[PDB]
Amino acid sequence: GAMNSSNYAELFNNDIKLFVDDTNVYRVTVHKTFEGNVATKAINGCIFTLNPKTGHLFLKIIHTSVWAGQKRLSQLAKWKTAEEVSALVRSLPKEEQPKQIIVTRKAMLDPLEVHMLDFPNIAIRPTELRLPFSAAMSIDKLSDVVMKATEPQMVLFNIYDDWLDRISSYTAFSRLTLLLRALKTNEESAKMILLSDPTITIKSYHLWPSFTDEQWITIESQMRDLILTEYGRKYNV
Amino acid sequence: MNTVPFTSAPIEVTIGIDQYSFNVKENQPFHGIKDIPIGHVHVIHFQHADNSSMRYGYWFDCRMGNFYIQYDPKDGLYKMMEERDGAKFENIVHNFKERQMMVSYPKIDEDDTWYNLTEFVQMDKIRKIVRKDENQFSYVDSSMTTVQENELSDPAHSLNYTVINFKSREAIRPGHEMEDFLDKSYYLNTVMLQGIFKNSSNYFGELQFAFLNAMFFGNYGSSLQWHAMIELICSSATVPKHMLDKLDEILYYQIKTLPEQYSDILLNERVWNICLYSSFQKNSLHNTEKIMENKYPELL
Ligand SMILES: C[C@@H](C#N)CNC(=O)c1ccccc1
Numbered sequence A: 001g002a003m004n005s006s007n008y009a010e011l012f013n014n015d016i017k018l019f020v021d022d023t024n025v026y027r028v029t030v031h032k033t034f035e036g037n038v039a040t041k042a043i044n045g046c047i048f049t050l051n052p053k054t055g056h057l058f059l060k061i062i063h064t065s066v067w068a069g070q071k072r073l074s075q076l077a078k079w080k081t082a083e084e085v086s087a088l089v090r091s092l093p094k095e096e097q098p099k100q101i102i103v104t105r106k107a108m109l110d111p112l113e114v115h116m117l118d119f120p121n122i123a124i125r126p127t128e129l130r131l132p133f134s135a136a137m138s139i140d141k142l143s144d145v146v147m148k149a150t151e152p153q154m155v156l157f158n159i160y161d162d163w164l165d166r167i168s169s170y171t172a173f174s175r176l177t178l179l180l181r182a183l184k185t186n187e188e189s190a191k192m193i194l195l196s197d198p199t200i201t202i203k204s205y206h207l208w209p210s211f212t213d214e215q216w217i218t219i220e221s222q223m224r225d226l227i228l229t230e231y232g233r234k235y236n237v
Numbered sequence B: 001m002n003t004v005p006f007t008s009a010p011i012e013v014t015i016g017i018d019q020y021s022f023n024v025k026e027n028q029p030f031h032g033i034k035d036i037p038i039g040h041v042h043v044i045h046f047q048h049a050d051n052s053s054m055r056y057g058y059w060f061d062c063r064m065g066n067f068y069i070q071y072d073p074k075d076g077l078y079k080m081m082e083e084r085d086g087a088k089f090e091n092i093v094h095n096f097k098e099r100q101m102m103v104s105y106p107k108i109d110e111d112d113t114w115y116n117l118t119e120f121v122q123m124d125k126i127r128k129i130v131r132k133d134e135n136q137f138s139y140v141d142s143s144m145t146t147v148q149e150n151e152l153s154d155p156a157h158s159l160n161y162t163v164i165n166f167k168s169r170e171a172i173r174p175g176h177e178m179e180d181f182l183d184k185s186y187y188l189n190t191v192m193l194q195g196i197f198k199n200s201s202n203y204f205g206e207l208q209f210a211f212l213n214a215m216f217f218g219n220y221g222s223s224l225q226w227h228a229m230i231e232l233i234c235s236s237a238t239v240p241k242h243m244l245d246k247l248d249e250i251l252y253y254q255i256k257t258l259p260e261q262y263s264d265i266l267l268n269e270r271v272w273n274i275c276l277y278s279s280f281q282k283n284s285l286h287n288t289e290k291i292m293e294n295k296y297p298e299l300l
């Protein structure tokens, strides 16, 4: 059934599963036309497909050419997402295919189900969690590869860097969700926290800075404060 | 005009014949139903006074044999049977008619209701959905499940309606996933009409048969089938104009005949609102939309 607080540890068991987030697939800027009407201009997007146990991220870049001459783009975007997730599953060896795909938005359920009819044993699940994966485009290296793309492209990352050498998947996912929640709630402040100290660098092969265990505790506390703070500046508390 | 005699009426029962019904008191001298119009299928149905549970009945066509009803005190129901001795039957009937112990099928001459509800229902096709080949008539009750219901448990006692499933490989061509899900014309016209049903006359008939079993027996799986067959048409952008015009007439008479106090359970809000207001055919069912709005505006 639906994935929620009560079954959260299931994410880190040994049954292969993927989250799919489609909130950055169809991205537009809204602008005025010379005649004073409103129009949109699409910009490159991406499907965010993540193994929460291993950190493996399959980042399918959606190039603006896929929308050319198409109608009802917000609806098409869900079906295009489902087509690409299905294609990814089919590309994986059988022993690497997921047993479950969890969609972050319920509107992806029917498109993904229909595209996965050939995989009756892969469960397609919604979630009650309000996960912050939209903020993925606030990770500088991910945003950069999406905007630079001149054609459809799949790029693989480990969204946990090397954290699993020192922490469990549960703790890694919790840190990821904290960082992304902070970037979503106040991107500028969150990025200030992560890069304030010029002596902590991001390795070429990593997405996040190379914090020590102690510095991660400090960082994580700072992100929590921000999320509470902003919750005051928003609710006046 | 044909006749279905009864041996007797040993238990108190409400008897229906098509859209008509009457109550027969325990051991009341009652000997059957006469003046049944030739040319249509008919249904004779039963609800016992003591156990309103289990409505049950028999679909038949008097052109296919001489049928009568007899109560079985062991299995506890009124059973339809065929009398093969033509002269024995005619003599039984004529005697019961002379003694005026037969209700008269009470058809008004202006009234095309039964024709309009059964236009495409045949006894040969009903026998291909309700399988009991030794009999020329077909038993149906409130509890019988459909083949599709069983996929999700006694097969010989099932309604074999054509399984319709919008999220299935039968419904969705590889490579046309979005197209076929959002516009079911392929599935309606190629898979179902050209490939299974054989023509629209057979699609309309199973849709009519599904409705009548839902209404007369409260058969839940039949109601599911009726609504699925409506939804499959309304969700197709490409439907022959003659089918849409006929569907409007079909549904009009079904909605007109539905008992008002059963609408809550027999009508699926989602299907009807989708069909009348959101679907490709939202503007093609004028008669049905007008009767639905004047008779059941709450559902919408
Ligand atoms: C008056 C009768 C005689 N003799 C003929 N009517 C019926 O047998 C009948 C009519 C209505 C309900 C049940 C039986």
Ligand SMILES: C[C@@H](C#N)CNC(=O)c1ccccc1
Pocket: B120, B121, B122, B125, B126, B128, B129, B160, B161, B162, B196, B197, B201, B202, B203, B204, B205, B206, B209
């Ligand atoms: C299952 C297929 C068969 N036979 C299709 N059903 C019908 O043609 C039909 C079934 C019931 C009444 C009228 C027509």
